[PDB]
From Swiss-Prot:
Alphabetically ordered keywords of this record: Cytoplasm, Heme, Iron, Metal-binding, Muscle protein, Oxidoreductase, Oxygen transport, Phosphoprotein, Transport
Annotated EC: 1.7.-.-, 1.11.1.-
Gene: MB
A GO cellular-component term linked to this record: sarcoplasm
Organism: Physeter macrocephalus
Name recorded for this polypeptide: Myoglobin
MF (Gene Ontology): heme binding; metal ion binding; nitrite reductase activity; oxygen binding; oxygen carrier activity; peroxidase activity
Keyword field contains Heme: yes
SUPFAM superfamilies recorded: Globin-like
Chain residues that bind heme b: 94
Annotated Globin domain residues: 2-148
Amino acid sequence: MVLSEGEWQLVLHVWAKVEADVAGHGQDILIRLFKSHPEILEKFDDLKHLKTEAEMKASEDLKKHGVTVLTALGAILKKKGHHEAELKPLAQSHATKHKIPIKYLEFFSEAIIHVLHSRHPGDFGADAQGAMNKALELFRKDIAAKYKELGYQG
Ligand code: HEM
């Protein structure tokens, strides 16, 4: 799938709102992810002890993870699909070091969409939601192919 310039503009318009508070969005996205998929929480050794939302919001380590993830994702989105340079190191942190299935990236994308709608409904209507889902689908498609290229089926 291919995004138009106008679609990329909707994605990056929304992403500008994330960049106004990267750490807080990162917290809310990981918390939503861990609440929907506690089996994913178990894969973070430094976070899997966190048993409540209040604990997760207090965790400096969780906040650091959120910033790391959104910083990398933001760099990827700003490439508007021309992101092969960014996907290679990311696949390796994910496809050799650990084994992060594509389905987990799908769950992560669902949490992003949820948090964007929860924090910015007035700037995140149907067109913007579709465009963000399209950009995240392209991310997942291309990281899946990068996985395979490195010898991991995802
Ligand atoms: C449910 C989805 C995901 C899971 C379960 C997951 C899990 C992990 C794990 C276990 C590590 C290495 C553990 C560590 O050394 O701390 C890691 C590294 C990393 N992940 Fe993810 N990840 C997910 C989604 C994402 C997404 C969507 C992005 C960015 C678009 C991302 C960006 C990174 C980066 C940049 C690193 C390297 C961090 C570093 O070098 O310290 N992750 N991920």
